[PDB]
């Protein structure tokens, strides 16, 4: 069942969107709220099209309304971090992804980009590249997956993965609209597929260098939510939307450095993985917005997943925590895939943990300060 807003005449809205807007420009400021997994937005009018992110003014909002502050000093600040073209309003309107700061200009608790950028600047010469496979499930407003029988289940899994046809793929209109919207916005979207669970989908973001991975994925998530809002359905990043023999949603992260991409870079890939072998618990905590409880429902070691309590790595191992692609093993260079991160992970937390363990050789149960 789709939302009441989706039943409003879309024809009418278009007619208003066809009006020439004139000299004023709309900027939509996007930020992460106090849950560390929700996105918030609002719009301001600018006098002219900004040429770069530097021209965008800082803004503010009430943190007590976003689970981000309490009491008197609840005013929070928005500092623009990345700019994109607005696919919902078209050029010259912009999407402005912002960092959140408290009233005293300290980073907000869900502001993970502030530290993530400092870590990325530390290893800039090694040029870390990331890719994330964002899985998501389309849901009706009733909390049941989009397209599934009322209070019931479709046929067993098997035909839905990369499926085509009215009985195989549910809500491809949303997937096509999102893909185009991301390409128009300047998001580094690498592809899409239908997932094993019907009404479950995936888009790939990358390759992205350093802090660009978190910006591109967060804005790609925002566009998906905004596109799904137009169609009147919900995109969930819950790691296990439906209990039982229905696939979880993960965010598989591909990681490579300049050394790993160069000839005979497999030795550096293996060195990074054995470093990851010794910090499995540290990464599980970082790979989930609430410390790894959500990913416990997904990482059961059954549905092409690994076990949350046990670390494993191998070439072409779908069930392992870390997978080296078969081609990467043959070519002796390229990347490795971390399959642990949950679909509702913060990419700033995930990328920072990979750099700290693999590149800065950090150890122990707490992140190093100033290094």
């Amino acid at each position: 069942a789709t939302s009441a807003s989706s039943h409003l005449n879309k024809g009418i809205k278009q007619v208003y969107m066809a009006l020439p807007q004139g000299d004023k420009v709309q900027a939509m400021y996007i930020w992460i709220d106090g849950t560390g997994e929700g996105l918030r937005c609002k719009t301001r009018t600018l006098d002219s099209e900004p040429k770069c992110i530097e021209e965008l003014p800082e803004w503010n909002f009430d943190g007590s309304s976003t689970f981000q502050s309490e009491g008197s000093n609840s005013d929070m600040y928005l500092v623009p971090a990345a700019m994109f073209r607005d696919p919902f309003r078209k050029d010259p309107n912009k999407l402005v992804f912002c960092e959140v700061f408290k009233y005293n200009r300290k980073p907000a608790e869900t502001n993970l980009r502030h530290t993530c950028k400092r870590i990325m600047d530390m290893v800039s010469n090694q040029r870390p590249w990331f890719g994330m496979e964002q899985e998501y499930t389309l849901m009706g407003t009733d909390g049941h997956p989009f397209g599934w029988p009322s209070n019931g289940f479709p046929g067993p899994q098997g035909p839905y993965y990369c499926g085509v046809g009215a009985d195989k793929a549910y809500g491809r209109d949303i997937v096509e609209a999102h893909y185009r919207a991301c390409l128009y916005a300047g998001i580094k979207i690498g592809g899409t597929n239908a997932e094993v669970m019907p009404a479950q989908w995936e888009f790939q973001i990358g390759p992205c260098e350093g802090i660009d991975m978190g910006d591109h994925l967060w804005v790609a998530r925002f566009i998906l939510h905004r596109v799904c809002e137009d169609f009147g359905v919900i995109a969930t990043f819950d790691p296990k939307p439906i209990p039982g023999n229905w696939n979880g949603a993960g965010c598989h992260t591909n990681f490579s450095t300049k050394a790993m991409r160069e000839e005979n870079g497999l030795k550096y890939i293996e060195e990074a993985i054995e470093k990851l072998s010794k910090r499995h618990q540290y990464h599980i905590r970082a790979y989930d917005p609430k410390g790894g409880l959500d990913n416990a429902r997904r990482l059961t070691g059954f549905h092409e997943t690994s076990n949350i309590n046990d670390f494993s790595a191998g070439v072409a191992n779908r069930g392992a925590s870390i997978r080296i692609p078969r081609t990467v093993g043959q070519e002796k260079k390229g990347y490795f895939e971390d399959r642990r991160p949950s679909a509702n992970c913060d990419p700033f937390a995930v990328t920072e943990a990979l750099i700290r363990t693999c590149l800065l050789n950090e150890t122990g149960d707490e992140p190093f300060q100033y290094k």
């Binding site: 020439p20 004139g22 000299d23 010259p92």
Partner: protein
């Protein structure tokens, strides 16, 4: 410029003859100094021959006069003068046609850049002011009068052609070349912005504006080209040497010899070579035509009135795009709405010249 086309409207009995009585931009105002110089040297040489020179030296002097008269060639210099002056006149007219005029641009702007509000009016005025500014920049680069009117870019700013902010953008550009093209690039950017904002309604109108802008800018570039590329100096020196060589030959070879020697073709002495002075008028003035038109943006009386053209273009463009934008008298029927033929009356002064059979073709009188 000296305009006399009213005087020569008809081929009258004294039409061109009375043009010799004019002074402003005339042959006399250009030549009288060289005329006095030539007469001074001729009279001094004649006086020296009559008095100072010995009787023995006078035979040598008169033989040298005959020798110099034999090589006085007036026909060949006419060819080099005709060809050189024709080239200079071609360049002069083409230079006039290259004046930055904004009439085409004002017509396109008033017909394509819309809005009765402050922003549409700002768009139209600024679009025409950019073309005016590029015209002012190229003209002050090429014309001495405009340069004395705008000795600095500060004078351009105080004149209202360029603003304070436009001045800062103008000076911050890193280029060692003349920046007369900058307001044209600003025009292109402003036209694109107007089209993006919906002030220009149709895609064709934007294309027409950029086509008319490139015509205006090419005229500015052509003025720069004519200013940079002179008539080749060697050819100017050739014509000057030919004319001056002929006149040096005429100064001595046409000297009045003593009739007592009885030399043929020299048995008279009028102490004034009036026919040589008429030939001086002819050839020296023919060279002076080129000497005045070679740079038509100077301060000669017949040079182009660049400041007047700047003032006219600015005032007319502002009027057309601001006060005349969408300001029309209501559509009404004319005097010939019901008339099969649309013909205006004639005054009493023109009827008796007119009312003649209309030309239909050469082959209809068979």
């Amino acid at each position: 410029t000296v305009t006399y086309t009213a005087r020569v409207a008809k081929a009258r009995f004294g039409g061109f003859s009375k043009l010799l009585l004019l002074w402003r931009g005339s042959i006399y105002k250009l030549l009288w100094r060289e005329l006095l110089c030539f007469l001074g040297l001729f009279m001094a040489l004649s006086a020296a021959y009559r008095f100072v020179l010995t009787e023995e030296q006078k035979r040598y002097f008169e033989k040298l006069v005959l020798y110099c008269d034999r090589y006085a060639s007036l026909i060949p210099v006419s060819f080099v003068l005709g060809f050189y002056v024709t080239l200079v006149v071609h360049r002069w007219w083409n230079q006039y046609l290259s004046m930055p005029l904004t009439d085409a641009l004002m017509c396109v702007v008033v017909g394509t850049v819309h809005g009765h509000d402050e922003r549409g009016r700002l768009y139209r005025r600024t679009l025409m002011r950019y073309a005016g500014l590029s015209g002012v920049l190229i003209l002050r680069s090429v014309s001495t009068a405009v340069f004395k009117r705008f000795p600095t870019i500060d004078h351009v700013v105080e004149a209202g052609f360029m603003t304070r902010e436009e001045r800062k953008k103008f000076e911050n550009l890193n280029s060692s070349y003349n920046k007369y093209w900058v307001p044209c690039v600003w025009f292109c950017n402003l036209a694109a912005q107007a089209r993006r904002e919906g002030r220009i309604r149709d895609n064709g109108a934007f294309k027409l504006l950029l086509e008319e802008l490139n015509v205006f800018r090419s005229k500015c570039g052509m003025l720069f080209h004519y200013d940079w590329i002179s008539v080749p100096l060697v050819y100017t020196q050739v014509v000057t040497i030919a004319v001056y060589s002929y006149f040096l030959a005429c100064l001595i070879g046409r000297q009045f010899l003593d009739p007592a020697q009885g030399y043929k073709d020299h048995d008279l002495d009028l102490c004034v070579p009036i026919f040589t002075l008429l030939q001086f008028f002819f050839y020296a003035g023919w060279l002076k035509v080129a000497e005045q038109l070679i740079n038509p943006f100077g301060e000669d009386d017949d040079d182009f009135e660049t400041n007047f053209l700047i003032d006219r273009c600015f005032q007319v463009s502002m009027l057309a795009v601001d006060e005349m934008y969408d300001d029309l008298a209501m559509l009404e029927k004319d005097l010939y709405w019901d008339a099969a033929e649309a013909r205006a009356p004639y005054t009493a002064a023109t009827a008796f010249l007119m009312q003649q059979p209309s030309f239909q073709g050469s082959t209809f009188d068979i």
